[PDB]
Motif scaffolding. Structure first.
Motif, mmCIF file in Angstrom:
data_model
loop_
_atom_site.group_PDB
_atom_site.id
_atom_site.type_symbol
_atom_site.label_atom_id
_atom_site.label_comp_id
_atom_site.label_asym_id
_atom_site.label_seq_id
_atom_site.Cartn_x
_atom_site.Cartn_y
_atom_site.Cartn_z
ATOM 1 N N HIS A 1 -9.224 0.228 0.229
ATOM 2 C CA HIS A 1 -8.403 0.479 1.409
ATOM 3 C C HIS A 1 -7.679 1.817 1.291
ATOM 4 O O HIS A 1 -7.412 2.479 2.294
ATOM 5 C CB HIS A 1 -7.388 -0.649 1.599
ATOM 6 N N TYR B 1 -0.064 4.239 1.000
ATOM 7 C CA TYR B 1 -0.317 5.005 2.215
ATOM 8 C C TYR B 1 0.398 4.381 3.411
ATOM 9 O O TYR B 1 1.264 5.003 4.025
ATOM 10 C CB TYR B 1 -1.821 5.083 2.490
ATOM 11 N N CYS B 2 0.027 3.147 3.735
ATOM 12 C CA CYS B 2 0.632 2.436 4.855
ATOM 13 C C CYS B 2 1.410 1.216 4.370
ATOM 14 O O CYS B 2 1.536 0.985 3.168
ATOM 15 C CB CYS B 2 -0.445 2.004 5.853
ATOM 16 N N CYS C 1 0.826 -1.200 0.000
ATOM 17 C CA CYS C 1 0.000 0.000 0.000
ATOM 18 C C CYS C 1 0.865 1.257 0.000
ATOM 19 O O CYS C 1 1.863 1.353 0.716
ATOM 20 C CB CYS C 1 -0.928 0.007 1.217
ATOM 21 N N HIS D 1 -7.849 5.816 3.526
ATOM 22 C CA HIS D 1 -6.775 6.598 4.129
ATOM 23 C C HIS D 1 -7.101 8.087 4.096
ATOM 24 O O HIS D 1 -6.760 8.828 5.016
ATOM 25 C CB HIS D 1 -5.455 6.336 3.402
ATOM 26 N N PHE E 1 0.705 -1.943 4.259
ATOM 27 C CA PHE E 1 -0.232 -3.059 4.196
ATOM 28 C C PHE E 1 -0.138 -3.772 2.849
ATOM 29 O O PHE E 1 -0.097 -3.132 1.798
ATOM 30 C CB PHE E 1 -1.662 -2.565 4.426
HETATM 31 ZN ZN LIG Z 1 -2.869 1.467 3.546
#
Ligand SMILES: [Zn+2]
Length: 37
Positions: A29, A14-15, A12, A33, A17
């Protein structure tokens, strides 16, 4: 990395994951965010 390289999923933006290689199920997902409903 003694083990044998295998299974390279996506990460991911953003994070940190991991999800299915490529699928519209992940994007969801992402929008989360930000602040989508
Ligand atoms: Zn994420």
């Amino acid at each position: 990395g003694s083990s044998g390289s295998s299974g390279r999923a996506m990460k991911c933006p953003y994070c940190d994951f991991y999800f299915m290689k490529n699928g519209s199920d992940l994007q969801r997902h992402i929008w989360a965010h930000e602040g989508v409903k």
